[PDB]
Amino acid sequence: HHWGYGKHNGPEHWHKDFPIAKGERQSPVDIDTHTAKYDPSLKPLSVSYDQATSLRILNNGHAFNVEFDDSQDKAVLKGGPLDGTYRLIQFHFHWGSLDGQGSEHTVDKKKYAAELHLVHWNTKYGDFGKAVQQPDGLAVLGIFLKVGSAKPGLQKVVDVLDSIKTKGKSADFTNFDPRGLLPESLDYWTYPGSLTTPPLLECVTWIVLKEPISVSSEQVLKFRKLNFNGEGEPEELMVDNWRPAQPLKNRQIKASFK
Ligand SMILES: N[C@H](Cc1c[nH]c[nH+]1)C(=O)O
Ligand SMILES: [Hg+2]
Ligand SMILES: [Zn+2]
């Protein structure tokens, strides 16, 4: 039936309905640090989230999305390997049932507790829908999460998940600053790829930060309290909604640092 994250509808079944699952630039992938090469030509990465305008948090049945208002240049990603401007439309996470797994991209095979993804779409294409029909239409900033000390700027998100336990629910989540989710350093690895959930469109330029942020056990815990099911249905906790690393094939990962 509908794609999910189980023994019967998980990643290993996605290709049947979504053939591109075995494509040439699928994500995520394992980042081999001793093979990625520093690129002296990458321009400084620019992440301008000052005028960000969050509007709503939504449980879509496989994760929760904090949607932003992108009808104007408010929150934009640029610089790095990107040409032009990319607008922040939404950010979501991928986590595990255990701190030992959860992230999608892996560093030298190491799996993080979770992984944050801020999705932006190339403004040169007018809108998200049109952007997802281009080789360079999207730009996703990936940030790893590791369990330890709590992340202040992430608590609003934590406290609100209670109101959106089940699939379909969506609470007003206005005025959330995504800057509180950015690690200190901006060093990153970048490669051409796709979205990690069906339709798995290969339209993404991945910008994966090396420095992970650390959240508390109590925080990630509440992420694990969510449900994949809809209200009034057998409870399936929302855990392990991450896709495993896919073949790198004929791609190269460039490091923004030496
Ligand atoms: N999860 C995708 C839709 C999505 C895109 N970005 C986040 N969610 C699907 O149901 O096919
Ligand atoms: Hg594409
Ligand atoms: Zn994602």
Side-chain angles (χ1 to χ4, degrees):
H1 200 183
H2 184 303
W3 70 270
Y5 295 84
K7 188 178 187 61
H8 307 83
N9 74 341
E12 47 298 301
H13 288 279
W14 299 354
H15 65 101
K16 279 171 286 183
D17 277 319
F18 311 101
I20 194 69
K22 293 185 166 55
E24 301 308 300
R25 57 177 291 188
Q26 286 293 292
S27 296
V29 292
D30 170 59
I31 293 171
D32 183 301
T33 66
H34 300 291
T35 54
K37 163 127 163 290
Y38 169 61
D39 192 326
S41 66
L42 298 174
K43 271 152 295 308
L45 200 191
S46 185
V47 181
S48 312
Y49 288 177
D50 50 303
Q51 298 287 60
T53 305
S54 57
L55 303 177
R56 185 189 66 166
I57 178 96
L58 157 65
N59 176 337
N60 52 51
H62 57 71
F64 63 83
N65 299 164
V66 173
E67 318 153 334
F68 288 77
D69 155 89
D70 63 355
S71 56
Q72 292 191 81
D73 271 20
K74 296 181 178 177
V76 308
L77 178 55
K78 58 170 50 52
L82 318 168
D83 274 292
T85 316
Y86 292 69
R87 296 187 195 172
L88 168 64
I89 180 152
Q90 59 94 319
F91 75 62
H92 57 271
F93 301 83
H94 295 280
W95 62 89
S97 59
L98 296 172
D99 307 341
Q101 59 191 46
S103 70
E104 297 194 300
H105 290 82
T106 55
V107 176
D108 289 325
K109 298 301 165 67
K110 171 191 175 59
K111 297 181 191 71
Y112 276 99
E115 196 176 317
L116 172 71
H117 290 170
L118 290 87
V119 185
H120 315 61
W121 55 277
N122 199 319
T123 70
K124 87 127 78 68
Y125 296 121
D127 67 45
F128 183 82
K130 308 302 187 302
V132 294
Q133 302 180 62
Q134 298 299 177
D136 59 345
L138 295 189
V140 183
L141 187 52
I143 297 72
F144 297 121
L145 276 69
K146 68 173 296 301
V147 179
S149 305
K151 188 62 168 170
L154 170 73
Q155 197 55 40
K156 283 180 184 183
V157 174
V158 176
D159 297 318
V160 87
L161 298 182
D162 167 282
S163 298
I164 57 179
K165 175 174 184 174
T166 47
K167 180 187 178 61
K169 291 200 173 306
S170 66
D172 297 313
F173 200 66
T174 84
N175 304 78
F176 175 83
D177 195 330
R179 292 179 294 182
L181 313 175
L182 297 180
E184 187 174 306
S185 175
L186 301 175
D187 301 325
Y188 68 85
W189 288 282
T190 182
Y191 76 97
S194 74
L195 282 170
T196 59
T197 65
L200 307 172
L201 311 170
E202 309 195 316
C203 168
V204 189
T205 282
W206 281 94
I207 307 293
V208 183
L209 304 181
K210 168 189 53 44
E211 200 191 315
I213 53 170
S214 65
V215 299
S216 78
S217 176
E218 307 77 292
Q219 297 187 300
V220 290
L221 279 174
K222 298 182 185 180
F223 265 45
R224 301 185 181 123
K225 287 187 184 62
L226 285 174
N227 286 174
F228 282 130
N229 59 290
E231 165 175 47
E233 312 185 313
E235 182 180 54
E236 307 112 62
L237 292 182
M238 186 175 266
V239 302
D240 290 313
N241 52 0
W242 51 279
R243 182 191 191 188
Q246 300 304 300
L248 180 57
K249 294 194 174 179
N250 175 60
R251 289 178 294 173
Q252 210 280 301
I253 295 133
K254 300 167 185 306
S256 71
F257 58 103
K258 180 185 60 56

